[PDB]
Structure formats: C-alpha cells, structure tokens
C-alpha cells in the first residue's frame, strides 16, 4: 500500500537512537506524571505543565491531576513546588494542561497562558503569576471555533497569542481517524480580543510553536511531517512562509533562547514508541539545538539522546545558565549540566 508506506514514514518506525550522553544529568524529584511543556523566565523561574492527559497516550497514574509546577533554576539542586490556582472563574476538577506560554507586561506583571483540554473541548486559560504568594490567579477562559484542538500557544500579549491545533476535529474518534489517515487539516490561529484568524494551514499535526526574541519570525513544529516551519511575522500579525527544516525525528515543543535566538527542540525519535506505549519498549528522548535558522545551512546539533532507560518521551527542552531542563509527555524530567 501507499498508505502503509506513508504511515511508517510519518511515525518514523525504523528509527533507533544513537546515544548522546551528558555526564551530570539528574531526574527532578517530584516529576513522575509528565512535564510536557515548560518555560523559563529571564530571572530563572521555570513553569512546568504536568499531569496533562491525552486520549490514547500512556499514563502511569490515571487519577493524577494536572498541575503547573514552579522551579527556581538559580538554586543549586532546584526543587519543584506545585503552584496554587486561586480564583473563582475556573473549574479546577477538570484542569488538564498542555502547552504553556508566558507574557511579561510593561509593569512586569507575569501572565501564564495554559492550553486546557477539559474533556473533549479545548480552551486557553490566562493566569496572573503571583511570585511572592507562589500562586496563579485565574483571569479568563478563552474559547473559539478557530481553537478546536489546541496543542501549544505562544503569547504576544495578555490575551494575544498564536495557537497550534494538532487536529482539525474535536471529537476524539474522528480525531484519531484524522491522524491515522494523515489528512493534515491542522492549522494555526492568531487570537486577540478584537481579531481571530487562521494564519497557516495544512499541517500534519502542528505541535510546538514559538517566536523569535525580536518578534519577526514564528516557528511551528509539524510533528508527523518531522518539520519545523519558519514564518515571517508581520505588523498585522499575519504570517508568510520562509523556510522549512526537515529532520529524522518527530519534533514536538519548541523553546527559543532569548540571548541567541537559538531553537531548543524536544523530539520523539520513533513515533510508534511514543504513541503506542509498551513498557518493554519505551520511547526515548532527543534534544536538538538549532542555530542560524535563516541562513543557507542551519546548524542542527543533537545535544542529548537516549533510548528511554532514564527519560522517556522528551517533549520540551530549554537551557538556562549552563543547565538543560528536559520535559516529557507523561514521564519524568531531566536536569542536566550542558
Ligand atoms: Ca509552549
Ligand atoms: Ca505534545
Ligand atoms: Cl524512541
Ligand atoms: Cl540566522
Ligand atoms: Cl541509550
């Protein structure tokens, strides 16, 4: 079949991980049920989305709740704490976080945007971060017909963001059929209070999304195409294609380093192991650094790679002052000397 061929191309089924080691990597105590996305502020506080659940993805603790965790990366051996969500505008029993993003106001108010999928429906929750009290003040729940199945967002103001949708459909049965057939109907939305538009479409599962430090480019990961799309971001928020980068791995969430502009990318080398879990054959981990992404030949380095004997299912990676923090879809988190 032509379909069985493109299926085992999309899920990269023949792929094995040549190890790339780091000598001082330590599992973060307290993270056992996922750390699928994370973001580090310029002051070294890192937010971690944890406990999220997906229909069909593995879970070691099904009654576990979704949590936003805090980590101070300026500490020597940093520990995670669960952030308290306060407010009355949000149903916490169904809180099921996925991608996250931050925005820092001119007053230095910190806003956290959190992709929420309570049930089959999909929202974006915006919180105010209260560092002293170590809490998240809920502000708003954002819902839209152009946000059917949000995977990750990148904030550009307190309720302004680009959002990936990893499926066109909302219903989980059609969702898996969509994903199995490879329709590639997932798309990217710009959301703002006064204006909500599709800015790109035709993606075979758009996952991570991020922005360059100067605002001029947007990066979008296409999981099952193994591609990172680079877009020019215009003053009217529309996007025009620029580069497409290709890899031998499923690219998941994208972090951008503020100083260099470098991309750090959490990857699933073999899509079968991450989608059809099997304890005797667990998914591995791979972290990519991407430099000089606008130039003729961009520099791609594998900074860390492993078959899962330590860390299973890396989905996000970010660096801070010599340290590398790696998160997983549903497993642990690895803190590493670079
Ligand atoms: Ca994110
Ligand atoms: Ca994901
Ligand atoms: Cl793997
Ligand atoms: Cl460049
Ligand atoms: Cl290995």
What does this structure look like?
With 338 residues, the chain is mostly beta strands. It has one domain: 6 Propeller (Neuraminidase), CATH 2.120.10. Helices cover 7% and strands 47% of the residues. It contains 3 helices and 25 strands. The chain has helices at 2-10, 172-181, 271-275, and strands at 25-27, 37-40, 45-50, 67-72, 80-82, 84-86, 97-104, 110-116, 123-130, 135-142, 150-157, 160-165, 186-192, 195-203, 206-211, 217-222, 227-233, 239-246, 250-256, 263-268, 285-291, 299-306, 314-320, 323-328, 333-337. The strands form 6 sheets. Strands 6-10-9-8-7 form a 5-stranded mixed β-sheet, with no helix packed on it. The protein has a 4-stranded antiparallel β-sheet with strand order 1-25-24-23, with no helix packed on it. Strands 2-3-4-5 form a 4-stranded antiparallel β-sheet, with no helix packed on it. The termini are far apart. The relative contact order is 0.16. One chloride ion (CL) is lined by residues 17, 269-270, 273, 283-284. The PDB classes it as hydrolase. Keywords: beta-propeller, Lactonase, HDL, hydrolase. It forms a monomeric assembly.
